[PDB]
């Protein structure tokens, strides 16, 4: 039961659904890309959203890309959210993501708003183990015991190079759990009924982006433009993002 979706048919991103996060300030992770609202970095063609990261002098940064979300226009509580994505070769340094923030962000600061990572790929452990494009993770980031930043992370080595074709990345979110899937197959699961996880019982909205680099202590391990070796331009193709409703789903659309 699809109750919401973006099929990305047109020739332009629907600005009544999406907003762009613009800046080159690193986004809390020492990222190197300047995320822009330009057609060069985010565009539709042939039935896909394309987010394209480029090696390019722009606003004091050495790369451009995009980071888009549906804050203020779409949010939901409970359901299955799935996207059909063909990630780029993360080689070394590209960091695609599909993820969700609580709908009270940014008024409620991270991580008190709650966060769920559906797909993250391009991590330093992958790079060290020669599993670039196979090793992914899902995650929860929230205010845990003591209200202190807490992260729960599940790693999965996919059987195939995920940049070679489209795959389905899904969260299944109920009043008791959040579960994460690749091509229908569960690879992560957390109970969310504990007192410290009430932030997961409010509406959330999705975000899609392709970051380049991070601090050495952050996701990619690669903190300078000269350390990025990935094939650029790097294109993440998103054929569609769909919400499958549950009985308890609350859909929020202004
Ligand atoms: O501002 C409060 C606090 O924010 C911290 O920065 C975080 C980023 O670490 C965070 O990274 C996301 C990951 O947690 C994960 O969800 O995956 C996505 C996609 O890859 C990441 O972007 O994103 C949040 C929201 O933008 C930031 O607030 C700073 O590190 C910290 O110093 C600061 O105190
Ligand atoms: Ca909490
Ligand atoms: Ca499509």
Q: Give the ligand with the smallest distance to the CA of 138.
A: 1
- For residue 117, the SS3 value is strand
CA distance 94 to 132: 10
Tokens 């993440």 found at: 236
φ/ψ (deg, to 5) at 228? -80, 120
CA distance 131 to 40: 30
Least Cα distance to 234 among 133, 158, 109, 117 occurs for 133
Inter-residue long-range contacts of 193-200, CB under 8 Å, 24+ positions, other chains counted: 196/142, 196/143, 196/144, 196/145, 196/150, 197/140, 197/142, 197/144, 199/102, 199/112, 199/113, 199/114, 199/142, 199/143, 200/114, 200/116, 200/140, 200/142, 200/173
Atom of ligand 1 nearest to the CA of 149: 3
CA distance 242 to 178: 17
CA distance 241 to 98: 10
CA distance 144 to 221: 26
Say how many residues make up the chain.
254
Atom of ligand 1 nearest to the CA of 27: 26
Question: Determination technique for this PDB entry?
Answer: X-ray
Q: Give the ligand with the smallest distance to the CA of 239.
A: 3
DSSP one-letter code for 245: P
First and final CA of the chain: distance in angstroms? 21
Residue nearest to atom 5 of ligand 1 (CA): 28
CA distance 131 to 24: 28
E strand or H helix at 186: strand 185-191
Encoding tokens for residue 184?
Answer: 């229908």
- Beta strand 48-58 with 42-45 is antiparallel
Q: Give the ligand with the smallest distance to the CA of 27.
A: 1
How far is the CA of 114 from the CAs of 47, 150, 197, in angstroms? 32, 10, 8
Count of CB atoms situated within 10 Å of the CB of 6? 21
The CATH number covering residue 119 comes to 2.60.120.200
CA distance 149 to 86: 31
How far is the CA of 233 from the CAs of 167, 170, 181, 187, in angstroms? 21, 26, 28, 30
Give the residue numbers spanning the domain of 232. Answer: 2-252
- For residue 130, the SS3 value is coil
CA distance 180 to 161: 19
How far is the CA of 253 from the CAs of 75, 81, 88, 133, 152, in angstroms? 7, 16, 31, 35, 29
Is the CA virtual torsion 47, 134, 178, 195 positive or negative? negative
In DSSP terms, which residues pair with 108 in a beta bridge?
Answer: none
Residue nearest to atom 34 of ligand 1 (CA): 28
Residue nearest to atom 15 of ligand 1 (CA): 117
Q: Give the ligand with the smallest distance to the CA of 115.
A: 1
CA of 141 to the centre of ligand 1 (A): 9
Encoding tokens for residue 182?
Answer: 């690749």
Atom of ligand 1 nearest to the CA of 141: 14
Residue nearest to atom 1 of ligand 1 (CA): 110
Encoding tokens for residue 128?
Answer: 């060290």
Least Cα distance to 121 among 152, 94, 160 occurs for 94
- For residue 52, the SS3 value is strand
DSSP one-letter code for 83: E
> Which residues form ligand 1's pocket by a CB distance below 6 Å?
27-29, 97, 99, 109-110, 115, 117, 120, 141
In DSSP terms, which residues pair with 209 in a beta bridge?
Answer: 67, 97
Domain count, the chain: 1
CA of 14 to the centre of ligand 1 (A): 26
């Amino acid at each position: 039961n699809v109750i919401w979706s973006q099929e990305f048919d047109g020739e332009s991103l629907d600005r009544n659904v999406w907003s762009y996060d613009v800046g080159g300030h690193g986004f809390g992770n020492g990222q190197l890309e300047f995320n822009t609202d330009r057609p060069e970095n985010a565009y539709l063609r042939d039935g896909n959203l394309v987010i394209e990261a480029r090696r390019e002098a722009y606003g004091g940064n050495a790369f451009t890309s995009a980071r888009i979300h549906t804050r203020g226009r779409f949010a939901f509580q409970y359901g299955d959210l799935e996207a059909r994505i063909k990630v780029p070769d993360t080689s070394d340094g590209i960091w695609p993501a599909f993820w969700m923030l609580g709908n009270n962000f940014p008024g409620t600061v991270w991580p008190k708003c709650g966060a769920a990572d559906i797909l993250e790929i391009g991590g330093k452990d992958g790079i060290a183990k020669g599993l670039q494009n196979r090793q992914i993770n899902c995650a929860l980031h929230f205010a845990g015991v003591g209200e202190q930043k807490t992260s729960l992370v599940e790693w999965f080595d996919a059987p195939v190079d995920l940049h070679l074709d489209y795959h389905l990345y899904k969260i299944s979110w109920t009043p008791t759990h959040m579960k994460f899937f690749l091509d229908g197959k569960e690879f992560g699961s957390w109970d969310i009924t504990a007192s410290e996880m009430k932030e997961y019982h409010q509406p959330f909205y999705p975000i899609l982006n392709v970051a380049v680099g991070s601090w050495t202590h952050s996701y990619t391990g690669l903190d300078t433009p000269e350390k990025i070796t990935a094939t650029l331009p790097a294109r993440m193709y998103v054929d569609w993002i769909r919400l499958y409703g549950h009985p308890e789903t609350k859909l929020v659309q202004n």
